[PDB]
Design a protein around this ligand. Structure first.
Ligand SMILES: N[C@@H](CCC(=O)O)C(=O)O
Ligand SMILES: N[C@@H](CCC(=O)O)C(=O)O
Ligand SMILES: [Zn+2]
Ligand SMILES: [Zn+2]
Ligand SMILES: [Zn+2]
Lengths: 258, 258
């Protein structure tokens, strides 16, 4: 009956509303993915409940157990019916879950504290004074783990061994680490999240360089789900009608503070 | 056994080699989609035959007959097994054929002769002096026909009844018309093709403004084809290993003339 949606607290995709405690269920949350879920549900004709992924992760497979965690795991093991989140379409994930055509484009990018002497990934790789890392259990880390491209592989070799550790549990922890590190920490994260934060007080970070790759976020469903077909057509509809662009302006730039 | 691949002569995706007359089969052609087809086939483990679409079109459904033309038609009517071309993923097409996840991102863009006093679609819609049109039987025309957005519907209203016709049969025809028309014709075409032309002699055109929308090219197969799954995984694999970015540089910028 009611579709269980798994999602993740990530600004400006899903955020606890300012006055949520006096609100109940889905009304406690706002954001790009909250509006998207409402649109998708409207067009596919289902009722839904938003749930925050229990382990707070996007999804990766444990090398030893082979068990998936995060939102991907919640789909794989039957704990949720659909994931509506900034979840990156990847080869490894497509092997175990289904994705709609992308609803948003992104690439890996570099976040620095304003004034930091870094302009590119190549820059980061040719030095050591400034440490840099990525999010745990996500596609950015996996991208670096598996890249045969010379510059990226060298970055991965430094990251996988550094001490203290350069990886963070949440995007917020990575951003805070940049802001409090006096320019000695740079954070590798998706351009969407980088560009959003850049327009938020205290206005002390910025995106530098071009994107390191090009990929997309998709709405994910359990493999063979009956929901997959309708959801895909809905994403295409919403893109063609300009809604996806409308939502993007609503949450990134109509909400800039800088 | 041998996979029949439908494609289209559109630079720099698929072009006739200089000595093509002395060459046979797939060796007659070169370009981004030629390189891509060789890779998709290698990774999916199939032999293939490139064939240029007979009517030279991408694909639209005739309002009267209801028959699909172009590469889309070749797939729908069983004349080809797969399309490897700059074929835009759209809702109407997804209803009749299957698409892989996108292999390239693009948006509708504006091409002007250098010096043309136009900076945006809004600029174009608000005037009469400079004519503008699009390709026939393609996703750009359909975009404008179907659009509810104010600026774009105004453009469609003008274009559909402009005389002489502002629509062209091939991208090359639209580009020639821009070049020959002394700034009095602007051409709406995808950013990928606009960007390519900008780097070709006589270096007299350019892309102006931002993209009007955001979408992707996919590799297409007949609905329910068993090739679809493998092709999709190959596209993701090839993106993650950086092949797609490498091919774009090779055919757009390494060969740039301006
Ligand atoms: N979008 C990523 C999470 C953020 C990141 O890895 O940078 C994923 O789906 O895993
Ligand atoms: N890529 C387009 C053709 C070019 C255009 O319409 O501008 C299509 O698949 O129809
Ligand atoms: Zn709607
Ligand atoms: Zn010839
Ligand atoms: Zn290969």
């Amino acid at each position: 009956k009611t579709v269980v949606v798994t999602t993740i607290l990530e600004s400006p995709y899903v955020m606890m509303k300012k006055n949520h405690e006096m609100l109940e269920g889905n009304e406690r949350y706002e954001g790009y993915c909250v509006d998207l879920a409402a649109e998708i549900a409207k067009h596919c004709g289902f009722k839904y409940k938003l749930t925050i992924v229990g382990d707070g992760k996007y999804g990766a497979r444990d090398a030893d157990t082979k068990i998936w965690n995060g939102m991907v795991g919640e789909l794989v093991y039957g704990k949720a019916d659909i994931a509506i989140a900034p979840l990156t379409i990847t080869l490894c994930r497509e092997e175990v879950i289904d994705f709609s055509k992308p609803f948003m484009s992104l690439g890996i990018s570099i976040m620095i504290k304003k004034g930091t002497p870094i302009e590119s990934a190549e820059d980061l790789s040719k030095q050591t004074e400034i440490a840099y890392g990525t999010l745990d259990s996500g596609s950015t880390k996996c991208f670096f783990r598996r890249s045969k491209i010379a510059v990226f592989d060298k970055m991965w070799t430094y990251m996988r061994s550094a001490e203290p550790s350069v990886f963070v549990r949440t995007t917020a922890e990575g951003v805070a680490r940049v802001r409090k590190s006096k320019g000695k920490y740079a954070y590798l994260l998706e351009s969407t999240m980088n560009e959003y934060i850049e327009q938020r007080k205290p206005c002390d970070t910025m995106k530098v360089g071009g994107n390191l790759d090009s990929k997309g976020y998709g709405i994910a469903t359990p493999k063979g789900s009956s929901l997959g077909n309708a959801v895909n057509l809905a994403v295409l509809k919403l893109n063609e009608q300009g809604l996806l662009d409308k939502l993007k302006n609503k949450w990134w730039y109509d909400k800039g503070e800088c």
